[PDB]
Amino acid sequence: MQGSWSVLKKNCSNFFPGLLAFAQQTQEAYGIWLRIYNRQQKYGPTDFVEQSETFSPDYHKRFHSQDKNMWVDKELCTEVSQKEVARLMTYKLDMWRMAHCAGALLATGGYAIPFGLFWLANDTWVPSSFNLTGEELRAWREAQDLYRYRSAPSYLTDTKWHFDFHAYPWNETQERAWDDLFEKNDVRRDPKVVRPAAEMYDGFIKFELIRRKSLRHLCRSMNIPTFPMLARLCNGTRVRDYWNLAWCEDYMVITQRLHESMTDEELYDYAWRRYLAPYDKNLNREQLMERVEDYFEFLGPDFVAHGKAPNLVILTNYVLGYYNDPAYLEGDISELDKNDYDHLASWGKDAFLRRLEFENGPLRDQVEAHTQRLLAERAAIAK
Amino acid sequence: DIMVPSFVYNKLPVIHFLQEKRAEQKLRRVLDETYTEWTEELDQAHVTDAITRSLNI
Amino acid sequence: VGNGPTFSTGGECMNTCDIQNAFPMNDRGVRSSSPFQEPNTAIYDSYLAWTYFQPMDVHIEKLPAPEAKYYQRHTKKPWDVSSTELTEIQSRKKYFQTLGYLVAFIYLYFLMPKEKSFSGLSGPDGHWIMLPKGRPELF
Amino acid sequence: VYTRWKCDRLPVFQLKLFTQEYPMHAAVGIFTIIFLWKHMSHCSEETERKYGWWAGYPYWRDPIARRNETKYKQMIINNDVDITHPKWTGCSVEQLEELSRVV
Amino acid sequence: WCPEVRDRAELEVDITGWQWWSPLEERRLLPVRLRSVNEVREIMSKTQAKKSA
Amino acid sequence: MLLGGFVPRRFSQFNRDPCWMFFIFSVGFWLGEYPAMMIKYNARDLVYDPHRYVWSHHDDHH
Amino acid sequence: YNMLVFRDPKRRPQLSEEERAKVVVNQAEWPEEFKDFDPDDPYKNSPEIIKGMSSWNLFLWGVECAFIYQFYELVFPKSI
Amino acid sequence: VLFSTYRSSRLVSKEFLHGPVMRFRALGEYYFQRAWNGTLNWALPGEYRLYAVMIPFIYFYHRWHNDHTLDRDHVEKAMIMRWGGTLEDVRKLSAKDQLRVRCFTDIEKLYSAYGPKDTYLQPPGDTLPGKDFYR
Ligand SMILES: CCCCCCCCCCCCCCCCCC(=O)OC[C@H](COP(=O)([O-])OCC(O)COP(=O)([O-])OC[C@@H](COC(=O)CCCCCCCCCCCCCCCCC)OC(=O)CCCCCCCCCCCCCCCCC)OC(=O)CCCCCCCCCCCCCCCCC
Ligand SMILES: CCCCCCCCCCCCCCCCCC(=O)OC[C@H](COP(=O)([O-])OCC(O)COP(=O)([O-])OC[C@@H](COC(=O)CCCCCCCCCCCCCCCCC)OC(=O)CCCCCCCCCCCCCCCCC)OC(=O)CCCCCCCCCCCCCCCCC
Ligand SMILES: CCCCCCCCCCCCCCCCCC(=O)OC[C@H](COP(=O)([O-])OCC(O)COP(=O)([O-])OC[C@@H](COC(=O)CCCCCCCCCCCCCCCCC)OC(=O)CCCCCCCCCCCCCCCCC)OC(=O)CCCCCCCCCCCCCCCCC
Ligand SMILES: CCCCCCCCCCCCCCCCCC(=O)OC[C@H](COP(=O)([O-])OCC(O)COP(=O)([O-])OC[C@@H](COC(=O)CCCCCCCCCCCCCCCCC)OC(=O)CCCCCCCCCCCCCCCCC)OC(=O)CCCCCCCCCCCCCCCCC
Ligand SMILES: CCCCCCCCCCCCCCCCCC(=O)OC[C@H](COP(=O)([O-])OCC(O)COP(=O)([O-])OC[C@@H](COC(=O)CCCCCCCCCCCCCCCCC)OC(=O)CCCCCCCCCCCCCCCCC)OC(=O)CCCCCCCCCCCCCCCCC
Ligand SMILES: CCCCCCCCCCCCCCCCCC(=O)OC[C@H](COP(=O)([O-])OCC[N+](C)(C)C)OC(=O)CCCCCCCCCCCCCCCCC
Ligand SMILES: CCCCCCCC/C=C/CCCCCCCC(=O)OC[C@H](COP(=O)(O)OCCN)OC(=O)CCCCCCC/C=C/CCCCCCCC
Ligand SMILES: CCCCCCCCCCCCO[C@@H]1O[C@H](CO)[C@@H](O[C@H]2O[C@H](CO)[C@@H](O)[C@H](O)[C@H]2O)[C@H](O)[C@H]1O
């Protein structure tokens, strides 16, 4: 979304109330995170707690391993509720953007003020706490959805093009899964058909091998600030933390069937945090439930059985496929009755163009026959 | 202004061809899933036999 | 028929290119110069071979106009700029750039004198800049 | 759909190109520019006379001397410099007057 | 008027996918074509047999 | 890349295309400037500068 | 044929000999510009851009411009 | 908020200078947008007539610049050095004399390394002025 004066007025009016709300949310989220962190350190696996190292096979660069460095706490419901986890996730997003802004302020002193004016004029990077009414929150969500729409297609195209250019699927089922994974959101993808793509891509690029440019696209699509990007293991850490929390909440919901009892607005928020349901689509409860159930099915039985989710790259592509709208086409078909090169009509045809029309026109066969006969006669005379 | 436009122009034909093939594949899969289900209904002779038995014949 | 251009080929022969399968082949066995179906495509042999398509008056059974619902997609975004609009913008920009470059070329090659002439009749000999002013303590 | 090359204006695309596509090349280029303007941005008068003129240095008018004369006159007039000061001449004003009367 | 091709090409170039040839995807999709009536009959017979089994 | 275009078969056909008309005009200039230099610089009344030994580029670059 | 490094493009035949032999040539339908068409001289009957302007005339025009360029200062010299 | 980062923020109407722009595009497209105009890395086109037109034009304007701006400096230096060492001394000559001197300079240029060396080397016994004539 582009900056506007109305949004600037909105954010300037709600600046200090927003800061106070952010501070209160910070205290609450610190409490929630402290509970989760203590539980992770106490009951987590040895590899997860010790932060086992996983290096790439080409340049031996460390990155988070989905199997070892991510852990789904199946018994987190005892200490932390689903709503608290959602609150922590939302606060993490807001805190990341606020932290980047504060870093800019500290770095540049008082010279960041005009950039702050550019910042408050757009809802893309302001915290959710700056909205004190429903309409303001709706506009803020619209800005977030617009950024997701802007960023997701590049991520999807990067993944698809690199794989298709450097590799091909092994079997027909993998071919169908790969082809159906990147369909536009106007058609419904069957998660059972698309799941094998996760293993196929695990053969190609696991989350531990994700490239920095692909990571930048993914973080753009997730509304995560990317400047300064720095090493890929910083925003990668952010992505890992966010999706680990999401998977913990997903296990809680699946096991306890909370989504069925979840209200409409809370269900919409739950889908939105999974990048499944844009607000501009005006989805009803049926569509939201369908998408959430498809997401759970994509996670698969192994997620509940062992807490192991499919490949994170393919999962992100699948969920962000809901923001891959059909390519726009505006204009009546009658516009195809016009001509594009009328401005050249005055120039006419030169000698070469006339020759080409004569040789390749409706009389082309006669000209070819005459030319070949003449050449044959000349060749015979020469011999 | 010059380079990216030229390479997009180069890309256009292959993408057009592949998307045509993909659409044909979708249509082919749509056609392949069509099967006439013949249904089976209780033969009336058994009804005629139960009718006769009920008469005490 | 008109004199307008067609789908660009880059001077390539589609019967031997690396993406030849993307170009339909006609009855005569000559692959099209475009994704479209062409009946009268030909090949010309200069130092290198190149495919050529000659526009002609041909009638094609026109399927009736569909409804706007089944082909219009209203997914336009503020950042989106269509190819037609981009062509218009670039045409105007390049027109103005061409005029400016023309003026620059004329001045450079026909009016601008070369600096540091031996006779001193044309061009500047150079001069100093950023000299101090109003700073007596500097000396 | 959004693309940097098609949707962004030229300055924005320039920044993006040299910050998220070729940042190292831009850094090295800036480094080299600084080096060039730090060590290869000077030319002595003798060097100019030897090589600085297309057809050769016109000694018959000595434009370098005129350029320096304009420079120094401008500096003296603007900065109110007393060129008769003993530090410039190495002698007192009275000695300067005595020399003027002598010669 | 062919938006999908336009969008895919622009995106591919914007993400450093300069190349205009895709041999592997073509290999996957090259032999695709609408089937003949007899082939449809055979496929329908196979599906009917599978459903009966 | 030299792929195609109008190619006159002989001299007389250069006037069948404006671009080749300009080309043949330029060729006329190119080839006709040499005879002019022959006439001008091999003239009977052309005289060397009496002061040619006063200065030369050879002493300047040396 | 060639004019220096510029070679005249030639259309590749597309018809087979059997099909070609069955083609009936009717030059009455051909344009007047291309009658008795010769691949070795396709522009023999092509119209001139400017009526009466020969190639030799243009060549001579260039020669005269060169002579003017070299001889104008001999008749109207100017001081330094 | 002050300036848009998107090219879609138009500053003029779609029909602004449509006619002149279309004429300019017609000039550009007529010879270049053709199958046989396949360029080599955008620099060398396939159309012959582009060469036939642009090589002479480039040579012509470069030659005019060289003759009237670059070589003129050497010519003036020779005139000044050989006829007084000052511009006023040269201007004391007539236009015909200056013409003779400049044409001798042209002669020297055309000889270069193959002409006779008596054009700049004074043979012993020659009565013409030497290098210390004006000193
Ligand atoms: C005065 C001098 C200033 C020096 C110059 C500074 C120049 C500017 C550079 C930036 C400075 C920082 C700016 C403030 C950031 C906000 C605080 C913060 O860390 O936020 C958390 C957040 C953590 O991010 P993450 O990705 O989640 O971290 C992953 C970890 O695993 C996360 O761990 P976890 O997953 O286990 O979860 C823990 C989490 C759990 O907590 C929670 O969930 C609760 C929330 C806690 C965080 C709340 C942050 C709120 C941010 C907004 C603040 C309000 C702004 C208001 C603005 C308007 C004001 C009017 O709590 C944390 O976030 C703790 C993180 C670790 C602490 C980091 C702080 C260390 C520095 C401070 C100590 C310095 C002592 C000096 C002693 C001197 C001795 C001689 O920080 C960021 O978002 C990162 C900053 C983003 C901008 C980066 C810019 C480049 C930085 C380069 C620095 C290089 C070195 C310095 C030299 C530079 C020269 C070029
Ligand atoms: C009170 C407030 C509360 C307190 C404060 C709180 C903290 C606030 C601070 C933190 C805020 C963070 C969030 C900020 C968000 C907004 C950022 C932004 O700018 O958005 C674009 C923003 C609009 O954003 P938007 O409309 O919302 O669209 C956002 C979209 O989402 C589009 O988004 P996008 O992603 O597409 O846009 C991104 C775009 C952002 O960039 C831009 O959009 C570019 C903006 C500038 C464009 C300028 C165009 C116009 C040029 C005019 C030229 C002059 C004309 C003639 C003037 C004549 C005057 C007489 O690209 C980038 O991100 C590139 C980043 C490049 C980083 C460069 C790093 C360099 C590092 C160097 C190398 C170091 C290596 C290591 C070496 C180590 C050695 C040891 O742009 C503007 O509004 C343009 C403003 C232009 C101002 C006028 C022209 C300049 C005037 C200069 C005056 C100078 C006066 C002094 C002269 C003295 C002479 C002696
Ligand atoms: C046609 C002609 C037109 C004109 C052309 C103009 C001439 C251009 C010629 C050359 C251009 C190319 C030059 C390239 C140089 C090499 C670049 C390079 O090596 O980059 C490596 C690398 C590439 O960047 P990246 O992080 O990978 O991603 C870059 C993408 O663009 C990130 O993209 P993304 O999509 O991933 O993220 C989008 C979005 C994502 O949004 C977010 O992330 C949320 C918002 C983040 C806000 C910023 C947070 C900052 C946190 C702290 C940063 C570290 C501070 C270090 C300490 C301070 C050092 C000063 O981020 C933004 O929107 C960024 C907004 C930034 C706006 C400012 C852009 C510059 C406009 C000009 C303003 C300054 C003018 C000064 C000169 C005039 C003075 C009178 O850069 C870094 O690692 C970033 C380090 C940043 C250090 C701070 C800046 C250092 C430079 C000195 C600053 C001086 C300030 C002066 C203040 C005023 C004094 C009077
Ligand atoms: C205006 C301010 C100007 C600032 C200037 C200063 C420079 C910029 C400041 C910072 C800018 C912001 C961004 C910095 C880069 C961010 C990198 C990043 O994203 O890291 C993420 C990463 C977080 O990811 P992680 O997963 O937690 O851990 C990384 C993984 O392990 C990763 O796993 P892995 O698998 O990748 O493991 C490999 C990893 C393993 O390493 C690590 O990751 C561990 C952390 C680094 C350890 C480095 C120390 C190694 C031991 C040194 C021993 C020296 C002994 C010498 C004894 C001498 C006795 C006489 O990397 C290495 O192996 C690299 C080792 C370093 C090699 C250095 C080679 C240098 C060659 C020198 C050539 C010649 C030079 C010239 C001649 C000199 C002599 C005449 O961050 C870190 O690990 C630490 C980051 C530290 C950032 C720098 C802090 C700056 C503080 C500045 C203080 C001074 C200011 C001065 C100001 C002056 C006035 C203005
Ligand atoms: C909804 C409203 C409807 C309104 C309807 C109105 C209808 C009626 C018409 C209205 C009136 C006319 C409006 C203007 C038309 C302009 C022409 C036009 O149509 O262009 C097409 C087009 C029409 O707009 P559009 O297509 O609808 O939308 C454009 C797209 O949205 C975005 O475009 P883009 O981003 O793709 O490209 C923009 C630009 C890229 O962006 C920029 O260039 C903008 C930034 C440039 C900054 C350059 C200066 C930087 C200096 C250093 C920084 C200084 C900092 C100072 C800080 C403070 C210090 C205290 O692209 C270019 O540069 C390429 C095009 C260049 C055009 C050629 C220019 C030369 C023509 C010369 C012809 C005449 C020759 C001489 C004839 C002599 C006869 C004897 O306009 C443009 O492309 C805009 C070009 C802007 C260029 C600005 C260059 C400025 C250079 C001079 C600066 C002087 C500074 C003095 C300072 C003194 C201090 C002592
Ligand atoms: C007629 C004679 C002909 C001679 C010909 C000779 C060859 C000339 C070739 C020229 C063209 C090719 C040039 C290629 C590039 C060469 C580069 C080169 O050598 O430049 C070196 C030079 C060295 O710089 P320096 O010369 O100023 O070195 C200073 C050293 N002291 C103070 C001891 C004198 O680099 C530069 O000029 C750029 C310096 C600024 C940019 C870098 C700043 C950061 C430095 C980091 C380390 C120190 C600070 C601490 C860390 C950072 C803290 C923030
Ligand atoms: C932000 C200014 C705050 C202070 C108030 C200053 C008001 C000065 C009076 C201005 C009168 C003329 C205004 C004309 C309309 C300007 C519209 C405008 O800003 O358009 C920007 C437009 C660029 O458009 P896009 O980048 O495509 O994006 C626009 C939509 N996002 O810029 C232009 O074309 C240039 C227009 C310049 C208009 C004059 C601006 C003068 C600003 C002066 C500020 C300094 C204070 C002045 C005080 C004056 C007291 C008498
Ligand atoms: C400027 C720096 C800013 C830093 C900001 C971030 C600070 C975060 C502080 C978190 C404090 C957590 O507090 C710490 O929790 C761990 C993990 O449960 C406890 O750890 C305890 O249980 C674990 C798990 O059984 C044992 O392995 C460990 O030996 C034992 O000490 C510590 O006893 C306690 O001190």
Short mmCIF file of all heavy atoms in Angstrom, two decimals, chain A residues 347-360, chain C residues 2-4 52 54, chain F residues 6, chain G residues 34 43, chain H residues 30-31 33-34 36 47 49:
data_model
loop_
_atom_site.label_atom_id
_atom_site.label_comp_id
_atom_site.label_asym_id
_atom_site.label_seq_id
_atom_site.Cartn_x
_atom_site.Cartn_y
_atom_site.Cartn_z
N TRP A 347 3.44 4.78 -44.27
CA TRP A 347 4.76 4.48 -44.81
C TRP A 347 4.70 3.57 -46.02
O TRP A 347 5.61 3.59 -46.85
CB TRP A 347 5.64 3.86 -43.73
CG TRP A 347 6.10 4.84 -42.71
CD1 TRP A 347 5.33 5.53 -41.82
CD2 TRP A 347 7.45 5.25 -42.47
NE1 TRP A 347 6.11 6.35 -41.05
CE2 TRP A 347 7.42 6.19 -41.43
CE3 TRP A 347 8.68 4.92 -43.04
CZ2 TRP A 347 8.57 6.80 -40.94
CZ3 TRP A 347 9.82 5.52 -42.55
CH2 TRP A 347 9.76 6.45 -41.52
N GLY A 348 3.65 2.77 -46.15
CA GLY A 348 3.57 1.87 -47.28
C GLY A 348 4.60 0.75 -47.19
O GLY A 348 5.16 0.46 -46.13
N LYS A 349 4.82 0.11 -48.33
CA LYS A 349 5.76 -1.00 -48.45
C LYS A 349 6.89 -0.61 -49.39
O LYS A 349 6.65 -0.07 -50.47
CB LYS A 349 5.07 -2.25 -48.97
CG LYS A 349 4.02 -2.83 -48.05
CD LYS A 349 3.59 -4.21 -48.51
CE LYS A 349 2.54 -4.81 -47.61
NZ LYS A 349 1.27 -4.04 -47.64
N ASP A 350 8.12 -0.88 -48.97
CA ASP A 350 9.28 -0.65 -49.81
C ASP A 350 9.48 -1.84 -50.76
O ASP A 350 8.68 -2.78 -50.79
CB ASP A 350 10.52 -0.42 -48.96
CG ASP A 350 10.87 -1.62 -48.10
OD1 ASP A 350 11.33 -2.63 -48.66
OD2 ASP A 350 10.70 -1.54 -46.86
N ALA A 351 10.56 -1.79 -51.53
CA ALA A 351 10.79 -2.82 -52.53
C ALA A 351 10.95 -4.20 -51.89
O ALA A 351 10.40 -5.19 -52.38
CB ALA A 351 12.03 -2.48 -53.36
N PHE A 352 11.70 -4.28 -50.79
CA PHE A 352 11.93 -5.56 -50.15
C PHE A 352 10.64 -6.11 -49.55
O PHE A 352 10.37 -7.32 -49.65
CB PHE A 352 13.01 -5.43 -49.08
CG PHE A 352 13.47 -6.73 -48.51
CD1 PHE A 352 14.08 -7.67 -49.32
CD2 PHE A 352 13.31 -7.01 -47.17
CE1 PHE A 352 14.51 -8.87 -48.80
CE2 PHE A 352 13.73 -8.21 -46.65
CZ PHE A 352 14.34 -9.14 -47.46
N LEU A 353 9.83 -5.25 -48.93
CA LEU A 353 8.55 -5.71 -48.39
C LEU A 353 7.63 -6.18 -49.50
O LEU A 353 6.93 -7.18 -49.35
CB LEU A 353 7.90 -4.59 -47.59
CG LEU A 353 8.58 -4.18 -46.29
CD1 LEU A 353 7.80 -3.10 -45.59
CD2 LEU A 353 8.74 -5.38 -45.37
N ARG A 354 7.61 -5.46 -50.63
CA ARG A 354 6.79 -5.89 -51.76
C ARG A 354 7.26 -7.24 -52.29
O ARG A 354 6.45 -8.10 -52.61
CB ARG A 354 6.84 -4.84 -52.86
CG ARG A 354 6.08 -3.56 -52.53
CD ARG A 354 5.93 -2.68 -53.75
NE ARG A 354 7.21 -2.23 -54.27
CZ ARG A 354 7.80 -1.08 -53.97
NH1 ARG A 354 7.25 -0.23 -53.12
NH2 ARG A 354 8.97 -0.78 -54.52
N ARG A 355 8.58 -7.43 -52.37
CA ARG A 355 9.11 -8.72 -52.80
C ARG A 355 8.69 -9.83 -51.85
O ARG A 355 8.32 -10.93 -52.29
CB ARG A 355 10.63 -8.65 -52.90
CG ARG A 355 11.30 -9.95 -53.30
CD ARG A 355 12.80 -9.87 -53.14
NE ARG A 355 13.40 -11.18 -52.96
CZ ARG A 355 14.69 -11.39 -52.73
NH1 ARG A 355 15.55 -10.39 -52.65
NH2 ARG A 355 15.13 -12.64 -52.57
N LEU A 356 8.78 -9.58 -50.54
CA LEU A 356 8.40 -10.60 -49.57
C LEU A 356 6.92 -10.94 -49.67
O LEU A 356 6.54 -12.11 -49.61
CB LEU A 356 8.75 -10.13 -48.16
CG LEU A 356 10.24 -10.03 -47.85
CD1 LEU A 356 10.43 -9.33 -46.52
CD2 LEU A 356 10.88 -11.39 -47.83
N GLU A 357 6.08 -9.92 -49.84
CA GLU A 357 4.65 -10.17 -50.01
C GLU A 357 4.39 -10.97 -51.27
O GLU A 357 3.56 -11.89 -51.28
CB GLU A 357 3.90 -8.84 -50.05
CG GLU A 357 2.39 -8.97 -50.03
CD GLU A 357 1.69 -7.64 -50.15
OE1 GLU A 357 2.37 -6.63 -50.43
OE2 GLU A 357 0.46 -7.59 -49.95
N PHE A 358 5.09 -10.64 -52.36
CA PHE A 358 4.89 -11.34 -53.62
C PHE A 358 5.31 -12.80 -53.51
O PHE A 358 4.61 -13.69 -53.99
CB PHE A 358 5.68 -10.63 -54.71
CG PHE A 358 5.76 -11.38 -56.00
CD1 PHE A 358 4.63 -11.56 -56.78
CD2 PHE A 358 6.96 -11.89 -56.44
CE1 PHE A 358 4.71 -12.25 -57.97
CE2 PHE A 358 7.04 -12.58 -57.63
CZ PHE A 358 5.91 -12.75 -58.40
N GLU A 359 6.46 -13.06 -52.89
CA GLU A 359 6.97 -14.43 -52.82
C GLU A 359 6.23 -15.28 -51.80
O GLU A 359 6.07 -16.49 -52.02
CB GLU A 359 8.46 -14.42 -52.49
CG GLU A 359 9.35 -13.87 -53.58
CD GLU A 359 10.82 -13.98 -53.25
OE1 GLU A 359 11.15 -14.18 -52.06
OE2 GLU A 359 11.65 -13.88 -54.18
N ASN A 360 5.79 -14.69 -50.70
CA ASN A 360 5.15 -15.43 -49.62
C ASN A 360 3.66 -15.17 -49.53
O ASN A 360 3.02 -15.56 -48.54
CB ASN A 360 5.82 -15.09 -48.29
CG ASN A 360 7.30 -15.36 -48.29
OD1 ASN A 360 7.74 -16.47 -48.00
ND2 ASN A 360 8.09 -14.35 -48.64
N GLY C 2 -1.67 -4.95 -44.67
CA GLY C 2 -0.86 -3.87 -44.16
C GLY C 2 0.62 -4.20 -44.13
O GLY C 2 1.07 -5.28 -44.51
N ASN C 3 1.39 -3.22 -43.66
CA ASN C 3 2.84 -3.32 -43.59
C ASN C 3 3.34 -3.48 -42.16
O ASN C 3 4.54 -3.31 -41.90
CB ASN C 3 3.47 -2.08 -44.22
CG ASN C 3 3.06 -0.80 -43.52
OD1 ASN C 3 2.05 -0.77 -42.82
ND2 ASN C 3 3.84 0.26 -43.71
N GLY C 4 2.46 -3.81 -41.22
CA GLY C 4 2.82 -3.84 -39.83
C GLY C 4 3.72 -5.00 -39.47
O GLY C 4 3.76 -6.02 -40.16
N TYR C 52 10.49 -16.36 -41.60
CA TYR C 52 9.70 -15.17 -41.90
C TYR C 52 8.24 -15.54 -42.10
O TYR C 52 7.93 -16.55 -42.74
CB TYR C 52 10.23 -14.45 -43.14
CG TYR C 52 9.39 -13.28 -43.57
CD1 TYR C 52 9.36 -12.11 -42.82
CD2 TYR C 52 8.62 -13.33 -44.72
CE1 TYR C 52 8.59 -11.04 -43.21
CE2 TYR C 52 7.85 -12.27 -45.11
CZ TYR C 52 7.84 -11.12 -44.36
OH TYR C 52 7.07 -10.05 -44.75
N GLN C 54 4.66 -13.84 -43.54
CA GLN C 54 4.08 -12.75 -44.30
C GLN C 54 2.61 -12.61 -43.95
O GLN C 54 1.83 -13.53 -44.23
CB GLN C 54 4.24 -13.00 -45.79
CG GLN C 54 3.54 -11.98 -46.66
CD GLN C 54 3.97 -10.56 -46.36
OE1 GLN C 54 5.16 -10.28 -46.19
NE2 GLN C 54 3.01 -9.65 -46.29
N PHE F 6 17.14 -5.12 -48.35
CA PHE F 6 17.30 -4.79 -49.76
C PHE F 6 18.77 -4.81 -50.14
O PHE F 6 19.61 -4.21 -49.46
CB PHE F 6 16.70 -3.42 -50.06
CG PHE F 6 16.67 -3.08 -51.51
CD1 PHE F 6 15.53 -3.27 -52.26
CD2 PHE F 6 17.79 -2.55 -52.14
CE1 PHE F 6 15.50 -2.95 -53.60
CE2 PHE F 6 17.76 -2.23 -53.47
CZ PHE F 6 16.62 -2.43 -54.21
N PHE G 34 6.89 -7.26 -60.63
CA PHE G 34 7.51 -8.58 -60.66
C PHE G 34 6.86 -9.39 -61.78
O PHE G 34 5.90 -10.14 -61.56
CB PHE G 34 7.37 -9.28 -59.32
CG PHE G 34 7.90 -8.48 -58.17
CD1 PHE G 34 7.04 -7.79 -57.33
CD2 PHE G 34 9.25 -8.42 -57.92
CE1 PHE G 34 7.52 -7.05 -56.27
CE2 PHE G 34 9.74 -7.69 -56.86
CZ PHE G 34 8.88 -7.00 -56.04
N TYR G 43 14.97 -6.86 -58.64
CA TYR G 43 14.60 -5.45 -58.60
C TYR G 43 14.90 -4.74 -59.91
O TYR G 43 15.05 -3.51 -59.93
CB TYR G 43 15.31 -4.75 -57.45
CG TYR G 43 15.19 -5.46 -56.13
CD1 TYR G 43 16.30 -6.01 -55.51
CD2 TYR G 43 13.96 -5.58 -55.48
CE1 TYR G 43 16.20 -6.66 -54.30
CE2 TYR G 43 13.85 -6.22 -54.27
CZ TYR G 43 14.97 -6.77 -53.69
OH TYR G 43 14.87 -7.41 -52.48
N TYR H 30 9.61 0.97 -38.33
CA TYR H 30 9.42 0.54 -39.71
C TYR H 30 10.55 -0.37 -40.18
O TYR H 30 10.30 -1.39 -40.84
CB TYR H 30 9.30 1.75 -40.63
CG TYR H 30 9.02 1.39 -42.07
CD1 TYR H 30 7.75 1.00 -42.46
CD2 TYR H 30 10.02 1.43 -43.02
CE1 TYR H 30 7.49 0.67 -43.77
CE2 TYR H 30 9.77 1.10 -44.34
CZ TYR H 30 8.50 0.72 -44.70
OH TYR H 30 8.24 0.39 -46.01
N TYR H 31 11.80 -0.02 -39.87
CA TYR H 31 12.94 -0.79 -40.32
C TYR H 31 13.48 -1.76 -39.27
O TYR H 31 14.13 -2.74 -39.64
CB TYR H 31 14.08 0.14 -40.74
CG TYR H 31 13.83 0.87 -42.04
CD1 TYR H 31 13.49 2.22 -42.04
CD2 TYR H 31 13.94 0.22 -43.25
CE1 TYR H 31 13.26 2.89 -43.22
CE2 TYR H 31 13.72 0.89 -44.44
CZ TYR H 31 13.38 2.22 -44.42
OH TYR H 31 13.16 2.88 -45.60
N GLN H 33 11.70 -3.35 -36.45
CA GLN H 33 10.83 -4.44 -36.01
C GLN H 33 10.53 -5.35 -37.20
O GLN H 33 9.44 -5.35 -37.77
CB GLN H 33 9.56 -3.89 -35.39
CG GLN H 33 9.79 -3.10 -34.12
CD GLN H 33 10.36 -3.95 -33.00
OE1 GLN H 33 10.13 -5.15 -32.94
NE2 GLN H 33 11.11 -3.31 -32.11
N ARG H 34 11.54 -6.13 -37.57
CA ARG H 34 11.44 -7.06 -38.68
C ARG H 34 12.17 -8.34 -38.33
O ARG H 34 13.08 -8.35 -37.50
CB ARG H 34 12.01 -6.46 -39.97
CG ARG H 34 11.36 -5.16 -40.40
CD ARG H 34 9.92 -5.36 -40.84
NE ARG H 34 9.26 -4.10 -41.11
CZ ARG H 34 7.97 -3.98 -41.42
NH1 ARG H 34 7.18 -5.04 -41.50
NH2 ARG H 34 7.47 -2.77 -41.65
N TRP H 36 14.25 -10.14 -40.08
CA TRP H 36 15.65 -10.13 -40.48
C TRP H 36 16.48 -9.12 -39.71
O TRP H 36 17.70 -9.06 -39.92
CB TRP H 36 15.77 -9.87 -41.98
CG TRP H 36 15.16 -8.58 -42.43
CD1 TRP H 36 15.79 -7.38 -42.55
CD2 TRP H 36 13.81 -8.37 -42.84
NE1 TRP H 36 14.91 -6.43 -42.99
CE2 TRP H 36 13.68 -7.01 -43.18
CE3 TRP H 36 12.69 -9.19 -42.94
CZ2 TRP H 36 12.49 -6.46 -43.62
CZ3 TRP H 36 11.50 -8.65 -43.37
CH2 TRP H 36 11.41 -7.29 -43.71
N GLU H 47 19.57 -5.73 -40.36
CA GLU H 47 19.18 -4.98 -41.54
C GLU H 47 20.40 -4.31 -42.16
O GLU H 47 21.15 -3.59 -41.49
CB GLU H 47 18.13 -3.94 -41.18
CG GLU H 47 17.75 -3.00 -42.31
CD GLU H 47 17.11 -3.72 -43.48
OE1 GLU H 47 16.00 -4.27 -43.30
OE2 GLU H 47 17.71 -3.74 -44.57
N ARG H 49 20.42 -1.94 -44.48
CA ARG H 49 20.26 -0.51 -44.73
C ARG H 49 20.61 0.32 -43.51
O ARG H 49 21.01 1.48 -43.64
CB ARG H 49 18.83 -0.23 -45.18
CG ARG H 49 18.55 -0.71 -46.59
CD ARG H 49 17.08 -0.70 -46.92
NE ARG H 49 16.39 -1.85 -46.36
CZ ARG H 49 15.12 -2.16 -46.62
NH1 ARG H 49 14.39 -1.43 -47.45
NH2 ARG H 49 14.58 -3.22 -46.04
#
